[PDB]
RNA sequence: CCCUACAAGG
RNA sequence: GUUAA
RNA sequence: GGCUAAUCCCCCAUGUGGACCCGCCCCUUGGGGUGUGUCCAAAGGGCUUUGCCCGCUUCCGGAUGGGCCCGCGUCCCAUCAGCUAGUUGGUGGGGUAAUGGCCCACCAAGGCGACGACGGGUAGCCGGUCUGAGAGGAUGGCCGGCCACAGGGGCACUGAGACACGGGCCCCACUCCUACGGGAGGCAGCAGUUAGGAAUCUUCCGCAAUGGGCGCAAGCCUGACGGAGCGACGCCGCUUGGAGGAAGAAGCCCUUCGGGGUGUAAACUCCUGAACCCGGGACGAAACCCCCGACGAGGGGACUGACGGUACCGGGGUAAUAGCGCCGGCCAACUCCGUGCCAGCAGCCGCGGUAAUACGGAGGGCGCGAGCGUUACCCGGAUUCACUGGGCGUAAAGGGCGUGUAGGCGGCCUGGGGCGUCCCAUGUGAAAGACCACGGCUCAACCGUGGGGGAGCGUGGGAUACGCUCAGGCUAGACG
């Protein structure tokens, strides 16, 4: 079955494009500890019908472009921008841990 | 190949009576009768207490050097014993006992296990009217170990077999004197064995 | 050395040249025909594009340009000629896209 | 705040076992309770009961001891000799029916919580099903 | 540490440094004799220790053992090392192997002698 | 094309064969499509010869080509028999 | 070789 | 001065 | 430059059908159907010659093989922290069997990173193998699977398939042949040479068997393979003898000089017969083919063995290799002499300074035995990187203190969802190996057949205690 994602979109800078993040949670495999690993996906939005905040399904799909091999399916439910800040802010932090940082 | 050099030594050196020569280790002079100490220059200076791995060594070189085995192939026994099911020191004992040349010496067609050795080596022996010269074959329940046509002759197995007349024979086999043939019946119980061993101490040395 | 089987280089030369020479007359003629149908010349521009049709099926039928390879370049010629037309002319000669 | 309201009771019970409390409150939680069912019916307690200390729900829990000993240090022999979490926050412990553990071949017990409630590791084996494992006991 | 801080760093597999860089960590190096001295044990220990300077075919040149009582090493002579240290010597940690190129054999050596590399004499 | 050949797995001057399907260009003792008999050509055992006759039918009945020994070991389990 | 097995001294 | 008992 | 055949190439026709454009229908990414228009087929050969065989054309499907794509998993360094322009996405083309920045035109300004991007180091990955109670650690030689490469780099042609180890082209290095213009070549195939190295074999036999390519067949090719050769390299089986034999030769070692040891060991008697020598002598091989039958089923017939005159049988028949390590403790096994911190031993602890069970020899002893030791490396013991299974007051270890970002963790009650978790069924889990059973070589090693396995992942269904998420409530934490 092709595969069947869900995830919360994190941008739409891209014409008909949408950067979908996609959390997943398991057991360490040695020390037990459930542990949660997550992933961005380009996903095909021809309509460009998803906004940043939807929570959407993603599905394995023929090649679009490099980079780029899912189409969202559908919409989850939205205005999810809580799950958005924590990838941008997550984001944000980074720019302060080289000799490139400023913000505490 | 086996160990082929002054046995009674052995029997000096583990203390008890092993009997490797069958006749004259009867005799009045298995030195076990005269001499029962260790061989060499310090064979009568009084003893120290061995320590739990010279026990177990001693005990273990005993238990094989009743049969005569290489250290390769009684271990190569005692680990098949290992992984197979029930008590392992028994079933030790059972391979042991079902090594052929050793059937030849309970059936007495030959009056000592190395005897009984050459007995096989050299053809003069049968398992289920084929021949077999190799002093390792395992003998299983239901086989007729017998001495070879050509050989019934043989003034020695004459001789044994004459001696074995009126003389009874393990529980586990049957002997058939007139047809210098014999049969194993069951794999010998730990209690049909009356040997000088405790079998656990071996046990205890390959454990190390 | 000399392992007569450099005889597979030979054809594979002669191949490669009656390969090479079908193709061309197939580029050169759609190309043709695209640009006739890209002025409006209907009639003359159909009438080339199935002489490229049957050029590039008859390719197909050996390994020159055999396969769906045929079919792509059946498909993007009748579809650039088509389109080129519709934008003007109508399909007069008519031998070869459908009504 | 209790970060393990679960690994609190343990330790509530363990430590007063260890002085010999006749009984000893823990804060109330149906979780809690069911545990507590299990200890009961499996006899290494008296008991509990619901009470209310300073308008807040409890649960008494009466706890057992053998009998007084003979020479030096005549304190009894404890029922619950050992009571341990296993899983806990931020290493959850799961277990499939075949992964149920046997505690001192028997002598001792397994609670995990199932999809079909709190059971004794016998009971889970029992049902067939697996689940978290709560603590060991003994 | 707590299990987070073991998923968030792990445990690390150390790894054992080599009592002997003959290189390839094959079991043996050929060489060249540079120098042939003489060296003292340490402290508890008296003695003329024989040692050798080794160039290797590792490209290595490392102070080797000469074992045994007798020994006809010279600048040029070429030898097999092995590896084995001398516990009273910092620095040795290899034995030249006797019996092996211009390394003769103990003489007259009538007990451990396949190591010193000494055959059989003939007994009668 | 797909092929029903003999594989060998007895060991030196002991042969003891598996009657396989495998795809012609494989390696003989390689990776084959499947098991469907075996053969010991010294019939050193009451069991020397042994084949799925149905299952061979099968394959026969797709396109299998046998080498000519593995349709002699064939017919003598009686895949090629009518009655 | 004098000391005590040495080093250092004669 | 070192090494031992 | 000229001649010429075909299953070579082309034109026309026939159009079962198929391809393409447009339309409609079904279906849902380019799947199937249908209508008009257009476009597209072909090769002959053999004879037991009026009818069969081999083959050719188009189409649909099967079978096998494969391409591309996606989830998850896959070493060390953070003394590598920021990386990115075909870079990320778009539209339209090119290319391919096919999707795709795979390539291009143009537009947009994006993509990636502490869940470790980028850089550096190392490395083909698996089935497995070794070790370990397990968890785990280490590993990937032989065999099977996948990948990658063919002197180094780039490239396409031919073809169903290659960007092709024994095909082609160019550049580079090198070798060889040159009449100096210019050419030829690539063992990481088998064998062999040489170099490097501690170290790794025959320029062997055969195509008989299995397997492959071409052929209607006969049959031809096949260093693939089946065998033989060399190396205790490993594993397994075997020998160097069996029984008798003295209060105990001699020699040699100890000694209290009485005697004790080597030791039934030898000698010697008798018995059996490794080697060898004769005679017999294989299985592996029955197909293809041929005849009957119908070129089918079925039934007959003939050819064929490298290994090898080997295995194995039967007859005769000699008493006929033993070495190596070790003996202070760990660790099984002690005395004498020599030596005198010397010569030397030594895995760790240590031993030798004039009576050394530790050095060197000897006698004796212990261990293993066609081996025994050594060196190197891996796992173990080492809960000594501790998940199972450790620690930090003084042993190594609390950050000099706070604030607080990400992250980890989260009180009591009810309800929804069912991500984690648990349960059933089912698909997958190649063979070999491992395990068990039985069986074939006289045993075994080795090998055959059969049995049993599971984690993981996919699919359908089910559970909801706990963790999660959503919704509501609470007041015991927190704050006011
Ligand atoms: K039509
Ligand atoms: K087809
Ligand atoms: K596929
Ligand atoms: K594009
Ligand atoms: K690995
Ligand atoms: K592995
Ligand atoms: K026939
Ligand atoms: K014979
Ligand atoms: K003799
Ligand atoms: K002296
Ligand atoms: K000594
Ligand atoms: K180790
Ligand atoms: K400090
Ligand atoms: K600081
Ligand atoms: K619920
Ligand atoms: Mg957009
Ligand atoms: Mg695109
Ligand atoms: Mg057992
Ligand atoms: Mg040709
Ligand atoms: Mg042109
Ligand atoms: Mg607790
Ligand atoms: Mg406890
Ligand atoms: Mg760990
Ligand atoms: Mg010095
Ligand atoms: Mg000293
Ligand atoms: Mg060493
Ligand atoms: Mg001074
Ligand atoms: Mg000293
Ligand atoms: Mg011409
Ligand atoms: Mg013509
Ligand atoms: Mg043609
Ligand atoms: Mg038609
Ligand atoms: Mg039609
Ligand atoms: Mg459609
Ligand atoms: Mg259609
Ligand atoms: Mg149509
Ligand atoms: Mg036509
Ligand atoms: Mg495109
Ligand atoms: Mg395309
Ligand atoms: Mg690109
Ligand atoms: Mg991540
Ligand atoms: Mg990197
Ligand atoms: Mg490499
Ligand atoms: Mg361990
Ligand atoms: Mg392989
Ligand atoms: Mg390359
Ligand atoms: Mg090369
Ligand atoms: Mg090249
Ligand atoms: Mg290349
Ligand atoms: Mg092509
Ligand atoms: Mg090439
Ligand atoms: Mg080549
Ligand atoms: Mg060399
Ligand atoms: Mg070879
Ligand atoms: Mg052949
Ligand atoms: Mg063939
Ligand atoms: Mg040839
Ligand atoms: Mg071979
Ligand atoms: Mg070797
Ligand atoms: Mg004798
Ligand atoms: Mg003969
Ligand atoms: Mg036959
Ligand atoms: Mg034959
Ligand atoms: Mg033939
Ligand atoms: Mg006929
Ligand atoms: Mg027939
Ligand atoms: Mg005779
Ligand atoms: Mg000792
Ligand atoms: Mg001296
Ligand atoms: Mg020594
Ligand atoms: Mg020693
Ligand atoms: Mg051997
Ligand atoms: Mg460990
Ligand atoms: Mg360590
Ligand atoms: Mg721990
Ligand atoms: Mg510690
Ligand atoms: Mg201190
Ligand atoms: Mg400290
Ligand atoms: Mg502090
Ligand atoms: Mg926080
Ligand atoms: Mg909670
Ligand atoms: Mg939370
Ligand atoms: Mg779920
Ligand atoms: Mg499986
Ligand atoms: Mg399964
Ligand atoms: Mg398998
Ligand atoms: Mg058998
Ligand atoms: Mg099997
Ligand atoms: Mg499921
Ligand atoms: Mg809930
Ligand atoms: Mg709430
Ligand atoms: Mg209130
Ligand atoms: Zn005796």
Not at chain 2, 109 to 126: D, K, M, P
Not at chain 4, 96 to 119: F, N
Not at chain 6, 16 to 28: E, G, L, P, S
Request: proline share 5%; charged share 35%.
């Amino acid at each position: 079955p092709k595969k069947v994602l869900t995830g919360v979109v994190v941008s739409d800078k891209m014409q008909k494009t949408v950067t979908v993040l996609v959390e997943r949670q398991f057991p360490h495999p040695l020390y037990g500890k459930v542990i949660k690993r997550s992933k961005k996906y380009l996903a095909h939005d021809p309509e460009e019908k998803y906004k940043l905040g939807d929570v959407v399904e993603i599905i394995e799909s023929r090649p679009i472009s490099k980079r780029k091999r899912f189409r969202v399916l559908r919409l989850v439910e939205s205005g999810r921008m809580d799950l958005v800040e924590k990838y941008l802010i997550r984001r944000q932090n980074y720019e302060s841990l080289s000799k490139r940082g400023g913000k505490a | 190949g086996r160990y082929i050099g002054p046995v009674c030594r052995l029997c000096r050196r583990e203390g008890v009576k092993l009997y490797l020569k069958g006749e004259r280790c009867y005799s009045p002079k298995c030195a076990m009768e005269r001499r029962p100490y260790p061989p060499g220059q310090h064979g009568q200076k009084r003893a120290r207490r061995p320590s739990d791995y010279a026990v177990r060594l001693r005990e273990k070189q005993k238990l094989r050097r009743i049969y005569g085995i290489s250290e390769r192939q009684f271990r190569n026994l005692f680990e098949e014993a290992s992984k197979k099911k029930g008590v392992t020191g028994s079933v030790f004992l059972g391979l042991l006992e079902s090594r052929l040349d050793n059937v030849v010496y309970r059936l007495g067609f030959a009056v000592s296990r190395r005897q009984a050795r050459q007995l096989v080596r050299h053809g003069h022996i049968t398992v289920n009217g084929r021949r077999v010269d190799l002093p390792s074959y395992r003998v299983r329940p239901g086989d007729e170990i017998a001495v070879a046509e050509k050989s019934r002759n043989l003034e020695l197995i004459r001789q044994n077999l004459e001696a074995m007349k009126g003389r009874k024979v393990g529980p586990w086999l049957s002997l058939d004197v007139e047809g210098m043939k014999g049969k194993f019946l069951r794999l010998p119980d730990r209690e049909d064995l009356a040997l000088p061993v405790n079998e656990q101490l071996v046990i205890e040395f390959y454990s190390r | 050395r000399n392992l007569s089987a450099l005889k597979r280089h030979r054809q594979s030369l002669k191949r490669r040249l009656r390969n090479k020479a079908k193709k061309s007359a197939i580029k050169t003629l759609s190309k043709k025909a695209i640009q006739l149908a890209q002025e409006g010349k209907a009639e003359e521009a159909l009438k080339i594009m199935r002489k490229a049709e049957s050029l590039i099926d008859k390719a197909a039928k050996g390994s020159t340009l055999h396969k769906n390879a045929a079919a792509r370049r059946k498909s993007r010629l009748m579809r650039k000629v088509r389109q080129l037309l519709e934008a003007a002319g109508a399909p007069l000669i008519g031998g070869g896209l459908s009504a | 705040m209790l970060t393990d309201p679960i690994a609190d009771m343990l330790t509530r019970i363990r430590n007063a076992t260890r002085v010999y409390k006749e009984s000893t409150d823990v804060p109330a939680s149906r979780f809690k309770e069911e545990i507590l069912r299990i200890l009961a019916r499996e006899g290494f307690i008296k008991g509990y009961e619901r009470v209310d200390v300073d308008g807040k729900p409890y649960l008494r829990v009466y706890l057992k001891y053998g009998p007084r000993r003979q020479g030096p240090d005549p304190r009894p022999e404890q029922v619950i000799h050992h009571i341990r979490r296993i899983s806990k926050p931020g290493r959850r412990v799961y277990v499939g029916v075949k992964e149920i553990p046997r505690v001192r071949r028997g002598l001792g017990i397994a609670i995990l919580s199932t999809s079909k409630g709190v059971l004794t590791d016998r009971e889970a084996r029992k049902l067939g099903v697996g689940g978290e494992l709560i603590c060991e006991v003994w | 540490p707590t299990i987070n801080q073991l998923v968030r760093k792990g445990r690390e597999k150390v790894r054992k440094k080599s009592k002997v860089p003959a290189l390839k960590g094959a079991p043996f190096r050929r060489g060249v004799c540079t120098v042939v001295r003489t060296v003292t044990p340490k402290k508890p220990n008296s003695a003329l220790r024989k040692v050798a300077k080794v160039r290797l075919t590792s490209g290595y040149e490392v102070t080797a053992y000469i074992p045994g009582e007798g020994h006809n090493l010279q600048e040029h002579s070429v030898v097999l090392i092995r590896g084995g240290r001398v516990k009273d010597l910092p620095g040795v940690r290899y034995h030249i192997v006797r019996g092996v190129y211009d390394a003769a054999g103990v003489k007259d050596r009538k007990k451990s002698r396949s190591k010193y590399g000494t055959k059989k004499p003939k007994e009668a | 094309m797909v092929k029903i050949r003999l594989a060998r797995f007895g060991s030196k001057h002991n042969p003891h064969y598996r009657i396989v399907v495998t795809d012609a260009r494989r390696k003989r003792d390689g990776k084959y499509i499947e098991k469907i008999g075996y053969y010991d050509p010294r019939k050193t055992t009451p069991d020397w010869l042994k084949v799925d006759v149905e299952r061979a039918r099968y394959w026969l009945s797709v396109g299998a080509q046998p080498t000519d020994t593995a349709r002699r070991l064939l017919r003598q389990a009686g895949v090629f028999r009518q009655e």
